[PDB]
Design an enzyme around this catalytic site. Structure first.
Site, PDB file in Angstrom:
ATOM      1  CG  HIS A  21      -0.809   0.490   2.373  1.00 16.89           C
ATOM      2  ND1 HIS A  21      -0.577  -0.387   3.412  1.00 16.89           N
ATOM      3  CD2 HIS A  21      -0.787   1.738   2.911  1.00 16.89           C
ATOM      4  CE1 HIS A  21      -0.412   0.304   4.530  1.00 16.89           C
ATOM      5  NE2 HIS A  21      -0.500   1.595   4.252  1.00 16.89           N
ATOM      6  CG  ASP A  75       0.095  -3.863   2.846  1.00 16.44           C
ATOM      7  OD1 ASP A  75       0.802  -3.440   1.903  1.00 16.44           O
ATOM      8  OD2 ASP A  75      -0.802  -3.174   3.422  1.00 16.44           O
ATOM      9  CB  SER A  88       1.978   2.156   6.368  1.00 16.49           C
ATOM     10  OG  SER A  88       0.742   1.728   6.845  1.00 16.49           O
TER      11      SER A  88
END
Ligand SMILES: CC(C)C[C@H](N)C(=O)N[C@@H](CCC(=O)O)C(=O)O
Ligand SMILES: [Zn+2]
Ligand SMILES: [Zn+2]
Ligand SMILES: [Zn+2]
Length: 697
Positions: free
Chosen positions: A62, A200, A633
């Protein structure tokens, strides 16, 4: 547990760290350019880390989505199929605005910055200008050395200021991404949720010029050679194990005023969420019938979806824990406490009332301000206003130009004008103009803008249609036209017949006054906020409590242990998910459509030597009690010995309210296990050259 700790608090948390299980010395962690903290990098809105001596960088899928989407088309969709570069020469550019920032030095400039602000005296707008002039001169001096970019951070509402100096890598390339069915397994259905089964992760490679200095993309550039990289864990991560994260969390609002909480919860979040859902619904419809729109709007759509779902979650979270009630009660204790020190506390209580008047002034134009900003952020209008503002700043010496518009900003501006090509379709953008013109109309004249009113020339559907047809005449839809106006002077803008440009010329005076207004409020904030927040910290220290600053895009450390949580009576989420759980979710359709090689390897039990004996399968994702937010993230999760055991990528549903009021029982980080990443790269979408480079193949 709770806390986004600045590195200069390591002394305070050296004890808590050991009791949780850290085996390295806190000493070694406080070395921000050493092993292993020196491997941790910033991307601008995400974290990443070096994992080889030849510049390989691991982050989330992402976080890489933007770059992957910039290299995708309807007919060669990398989001869908993944990407794998067998040699470093097959790596593609992540785009001209892609960056890797490598920390070099941190400096306290608190006294200096406070002295510059003080000198402005008792004039709000002058305090903002004096801080801006201080920052610019500090930055220009820090940036005098070639290849470094710097940043001034304000902590705890202006009580501390630190300067970060970073080596700015400017040629970043995509080396591997798993297919989207892995990278984003479960889509928006599973986003912000546990149980989670999502791979991810993705990889970049950082490049500098042959002389070792950073440079923009060129085929003569070579891999960067980091001084520090991370190694994969040799010990299996299990339930209860120590873990820690280092990264760049963007924003928290834990020390805000009760009434700033009320305003966000009652107005900002429901309003933004509604708007994003509206635009989602429009672009989804167009994309079903037009694969060009679908691919070109995919990164935008991923963001709208993410943010709107977050906001829904927070509102549910606020109800669950009575966040309004907790803010109200705690603020009473604080006020109460200050009143009982008389003249000692008086500065802080004045700070408090000033903060609420600043809130009230901003509420008075909230609707105008948000609506106008978002209307001007559609593609052609954002382009025209940015480009015209640049032509106005070009007439000043660099030192007086607005931040965003100095020489140091020109490469990002130019890069954004070119990336736009991959994220614009005229017919899609027209509908978004249309939506925003309808929302403009529906303001009361109370919240309206004289120049836009004038330029529209009517307050009805006919006026909207006319505007739309006028703006359809712009040439700014082509990259080459954008780049032409990028170099033109202000008189040329002012003489132009381009209807997007004329809009920018008509609104600019209003836009600058509105900006002057913001800088005035911010200048008042600069006086009041630091006084209030010091006193909030002094109070918390009286209650014997944990004290750490709200997140502000600087490097933070969070630590704790691998653990689940209990979402309700009779039930508990376990710390790990497994391969069999990925397959139990398979439907054959978006977004539960794993590649066939995943389905086969799991039905055959090909665990690739990566099985954790305690769970009887390869772990996929895991829960922990770490404290993260947007910006984290891609951060590496390290074990007791500072080895890599996963990547942070999300938070559970019930935790997202923790941005305002922390809830220890249900606040967890969701991470992708380093073993799942290995497993995907051995069994599903193979990249044996990367495994070899990281000495795990
Ligand atoms: C596309 C999805 C997976 C994005 C995540 N929901 C997300 O926003 N993750 C953030 C970290 C967790 C957090 O916000 O607390 C992030 O991107 O930084
Ligand atoms: Zn090393
Ligand atoms: Zn150029
Ligand atoms: Zn086995």
């Amino acid at each position: 547990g709770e806390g986004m700790w600045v590195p200069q608090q390591l002394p305070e948390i050296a004890g808590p760290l050991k009791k949780a299980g850290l085996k390295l010395s806190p000493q070694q962690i406080s070395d921000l350019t050493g092993d292993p903290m020196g491997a941790v990098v910033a991307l601008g809105g995400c974290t990443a880390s070096f994992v080889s001596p030849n510049g390989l960088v691991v982050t989330n899928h992402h976080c890489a989505y933007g770059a992957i989407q910039l290299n995708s088309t309807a007919e060669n969709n990398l989001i869908k199929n993944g990407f794998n570069a067998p040699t470093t020469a097959d790596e593609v550019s992540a785009g001209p605005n892609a960056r890797v920032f490598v920390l070099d030095e941190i400096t306290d400039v608190t006294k200096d910055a406070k002295a510059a602000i003080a000198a402005a005296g008792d004039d709000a707008l002058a305090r903002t200008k004096a801080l801006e002039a201080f920052e610019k001169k500090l930055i220009a001096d820090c940036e005098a050395e070639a290849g470094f970019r710097c940043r001034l951070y304000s902590f705890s509402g202006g009580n501390t200021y630190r300067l970060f100096k970073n080596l700015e890598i400017k040629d970043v390339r995509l080396a591997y991404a798993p297919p989207g069915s892995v990278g984003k397994f479960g889509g928006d259905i599973d986003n912000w949720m546990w149980p989670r089964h999502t791979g991810d992760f993705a990889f970049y490679r950082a490049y500098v010029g042959k002389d070792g200095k950073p440079a923009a993309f060129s085929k003569d550039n070579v891999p960067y050679q980091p001084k520090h990289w991370l190694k994969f864990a040799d010990q299996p991560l299990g339930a209860g194990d120590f873990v820690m994260v280092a990264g760049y969390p963007g924003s928290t609002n834990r020390y805000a005023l009760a009434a700033e909480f009320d305003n966000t919860a009652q107005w900002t979040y429901p309003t933004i969420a509604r708007h994003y859902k509206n635009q989602i619904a429009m672009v989804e419809a167009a994309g079903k019938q037009n694969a060009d729109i679908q691919v070109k709007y995919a990164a935008t759509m991923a963001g709208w979806n993410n943010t709107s779902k977050n906001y829904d979650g927070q509102l549910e979270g606020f109800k669950r824990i009575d966040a309004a009630g907790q803010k109200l009660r705690e603020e009473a204790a604080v006020l109460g406490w200050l009143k009982g020190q008389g003249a000692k506390g008086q500065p802080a209580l004045d700070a408090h009332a000033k903060l609420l008047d600043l809130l009230e002034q901003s509420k008075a134009t909230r609707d105008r301000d948000l609506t106008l900003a978002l209307f001007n952020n559609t593609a052609m209008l954002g382009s025209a206003t940015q480009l015209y503002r640049l032509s106005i700043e070009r007439e000043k010496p660099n030192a007086e130009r607005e931040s965003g518009y100095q020489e140091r900003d020109l490469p990002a501006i130019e890069g954004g004008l070119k990336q736009l090509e991959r994220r614009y379709v005229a017919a899609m953008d027209r509908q978004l103009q249309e939506y925003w013109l309808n929302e403009y109309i529906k303001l009361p004249a109370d919240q309206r803008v004289a120049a836009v009113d004038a330029w529209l020339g009517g307050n009805d559907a006919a006026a909207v249609k006319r505007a739309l047809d006028r703006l359809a005449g712009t040439k700014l839809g082509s990259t080459e036209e954008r780049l032409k106006w990028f170099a033109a002077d202000r008189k040329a803008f002012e003489a132009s017949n381009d209807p997007a440009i004329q809009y920018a010329v008509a609104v600019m005076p209003t836009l600058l006054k509105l900006e002057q207004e913001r800088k005035t409020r911010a200048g008042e904030n600069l006086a009041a906020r630091p006084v209030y927040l010091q006193a909030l910290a002094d109070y918390k220290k009286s209650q014997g409590e944990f004290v750490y600053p709200d997140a502000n895009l600087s490097l933070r450390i969070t630590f704790g242990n691998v653990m689940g949580y209990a979402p309700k009576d009779g039930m508990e989420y376990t710390p790990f998910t497994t391969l069999e759980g990925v397959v139990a979710k398979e439907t054959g359709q978006d977004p539960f459509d794993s590649p066939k090689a995943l389905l086969d390897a799991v039905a055959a039990k090909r665990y690739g030597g990566l099985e954790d004996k305690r769970i009887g399968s390869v772990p996929v994702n895991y829960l922990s009690d770490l404290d993260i937010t947007g910006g984290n993230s891609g951060s590496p999760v390290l074990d007791a010995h500072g080895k890599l055991v996963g990547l942070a990528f999300d938070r559970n549903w019930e935790s997202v309210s923790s941005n305002w009021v922390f809830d220890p029982k249900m606040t967890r980080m969701i991470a992708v296990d380093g073993r799942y990443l290995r497993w995907i790269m051995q069994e599903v979408y193979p990249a044996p050259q990367l495994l070899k480079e990281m000495n795990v193949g």
